[PDB]
Short mmCIF file of C-alpha atoms and ligand atoms in Angstrom, two decimals:
data_model
loop_
_atom_site.label_atom_id
_atom_site.label_comp_id
_atom_site.label_asym_id
_atom_site.label_seq_id
_atom_site.Cartn_x
_atom_site.Cartn_y
_atom_site.Cartn_z
CA UNK I 1 -5.06 3.13 -15.57
CA UNK I 2 -6.41 0.06 -13.22
CA UNK I 3 -5.96 -3.00 -12.26
CA UNK I 4 -7.54 -5.73 -10.23
CA UNK I 5 -6.68 -8.85 -8.25
CA UNK I 6 -10.11 -10.82 -9.15
CA UNK I 7 -10.15 -13.65 -6.71
CA UNK I 8 -7.79 -12.78 -3.63
CA UNK I 9 -6.88 -15.45 -1.22
CA UNK I 10 -5.69 -14.36 2.49
CA UNK I 11 -3.10 -17.15 2.56
CA UNK I 12 -0.67 -19.14 1.12
CA UNK I 13 2.16 -22.15 1.85
CA UNK I 14 5.60 -21.39 0.58
CA UNK I 15 5.52 -23.90 -2.23
CA UNK I 16 2.48 -23.19 -3.58
CA UNK I 17 1.23 -21.00 -6.64
CA UNK I 18 -1.38 -18.55 -6.98
CA UNK I 19 -3.76 -19.00 -9.89
CA UNK I 20 -4.36 -15.20 -10.38
CA UNK I 21 -7.09 -13.77 -11.88
CA UNK I 22 -5.82 -10.42 -13.40
CA UNK I 23 -7.73 -7.38 -15.51
CA UNK I 24 -5.79 -4.67 -16.36
CA UNK I 25 -6.40 -1.34 -18.54
CA UNK I 26 -4.04 0.86 -19.65
CA UNK I 27 -6.35 4.08 -19.20
CA UNK I 28 -7.83 5.98 -22.30
CA UNK I 29 -5.10 7.86 -23.85
CA UNK I 30 -2.37 5.56 -22.45
CA UNK I 31 -0.03 2.25 -23.71
CA UNK I 32 0.32 -0.60 -20.84
CA UNK I 33 4.53 -1.01 -20.66
CA UNK I 34 4.18 -3.63 -18.43
CA UNK I 35 1.74 -5.89 -16.06
CA UNK I 36 4.40 -6.90 -12.80
CA UNK I 37 4.16 -9.53 -9.40
CA UNK I 38 6.22 -9.47 -7.26
CA UNK I 39 5.95 -10.70 -3.04
CA UNK I 40 7.02 -8.00 -1.45
CA UNK I 41 8.43 -8.38 2.06
CA UNK I 42 7.00 -4.76 4.24
CA UNK I 43 8.26 -2.89 7.37
CA UNK I 44 5.28 -1.34 9.23
CA UNK I 45 5.93 1.78 6.98
CA UNK I 46 4.85 -0.03 4.56
CA UNK I 47 8.89 0.05 2.87
CA UNK I 48 9.95 -2.79 0.75
CA UNK I 49 12.80 -4.72 2.55
CA UNK I 50 13.10 -7.55 0.50
CA UNK I 51 11.47 -8.40 -3.22
CA UNK I 52 10.66 -11.92 -4.56
CA UNK I 53 10.34 -13.36 -8.21
CA UNK I 54 9.50 -10.52 -10.12
CA UNK I 55 7.59 -11.70 -13.15
CA UNK I 56 5.72 -9.45 -16.34
CA UNK I 57 3.08 -11.14 -17.33
CA UNK I 58 2.14 -9.25 -19.92
CA UNK I 59 5.32 -7.02 -21.39
CA UNK I 60 6.69 -6.39 -24.82
CA UNK I 61 5.26 -4.93 -27.32
CA UNK I 62 1.58 -5.61 -28.99
CA UNK I 63 -0.34 -5.84 -25.86
CA UNK I 64 -3.93 -5.87 -25.41
CA UNK I 65 -3.94 -2.11 -23.31
CA UNK I 66 -6.72 -3.72 -21.38
CA UNK I 67 -7.36 -7.62 -20.98
CA UNK I 68 -8.34 -9.60 -18.11
CA UNK I 69 -5.25 -12.65 -18.07
CA UNK I 70 -4.89 -15.91 -15.64
CA UNK I 71 -1.69 -16.15 -14.44
CA UNK I 72 -0.28 -18.87 -12.49
CA UNK I 73 2.51 -16.67 -9.38
CA UNK I 74 4.53 -19.65 -7.63
CA UNK I 75 6.11 -18.56 -3.32
CA UNK I 76 9.19 -19.77 -3.62
CA UNK I 77 9.36 -23.28 -0.56
CA UNK I 78 12.10 -21.25 1.41
CA UNK I 79 10.63 -18.20 1.57
CA UNK I 80 10.16 -17.08 5.61
CA UNK I 81 7.04 -17.86 7.08
CA UNK I 82 4.98 -14.43 8.06
CA UNK I 83 5.51 -15.59 11.83
CA UNK I 84 9.16 -15.22 11.38
CA UNK I 85 9.55 -11.69 10.56
CA UNK I 86 10.44 -9.15 12.39
CA UNK I 87 8.46 -7.40 14.27
CA UNK I 88 6.30 -5.21 12.61
CA UNK I 89 6.84 -6.90 8.64
CA UNK I 90 4.44 -8.15 6.41
CA UNK I 91 4.19 -9.49 2.74
CA UNK I 92 2.53 -7.76 0.46
CA UNK I 93 1.74 -9.49 -3.34
CA UNK I 94 2.67 -6.31 -5.47
CA UNK I 95 0.40 -6.24 -8.37
CA UNK I 96 0.66 -3.38 -10.43
CA UNK I 97 0.67 -1.98 -14.08
CA UNK I 98 2.59 0.44 -15.55
CA UNK I 99 2.26 2.69 -18.59
CA UNK I 100 3.15 4.74 -21.06
CA UNK I 101 7.19 3.60 -20.06
CA UNK I 102 7.24 3.66 -16.72
CA UNK I 103 5.82 7.21 -17.18
CA UNK I 104 2.14 6.45 -14.48
CA UNK I 105 0.95 3.94 -12.55
CA UNK I 106 -1.45 1.42 -10.56
CA UNK I 107 -1.90 -1.17 -8.59
CA UNK I 108 -4.12 -3.72 -6.63
CA UNK I 109 -1.05 -4.51 -3.92
CA UNK I 110 -2.93 -7.33 -1.63
CA UNK I 111 -1.40 -7.93 2.11
CA UNK I 112 -1.18 -12.18 2.01
CA UNK I 113 0.11 -14.16 4.96
CA UNK I 114 2.81 -16.53 4.33
CA UNK I 115 1.99 -20.34 6.62
CA UNK I 116 2.81 -23.77 7.41
CA UNK I 117 -0.83 -25.39 7.26
CA UNK I 118 1.36 -28.53 8.74
CA UNK I 119 1.78 -26.40 11.98
CA1 LIG P 1 -7.33 -2.60 -3.71
#
């Protein structure tokens, strides 16, 4: 199993939408269970502290095991800016595929900065 976010960007302003282009493949012998995108606040040990707006752009049965999709992912306008997080904490855009009913996973989790471009 594999998954890539093909059009990465480093930052986003809360309230904006990221137009994700995502390639995934469940892998030979596997069946896609879902593809999920969720914004996470992490600590310095890469342990999740908060999860925001969990989405499942691929889900259900009869989905293609491998495809490239476009998916608009929104950051709520009131999620705290990166500069206002506790020391060492950061945002990670979790982008991942589950195969075989959560039997195995792969990810293209990508660090992102939430900032206010007016400031
Ligand atoms: Ca990666």
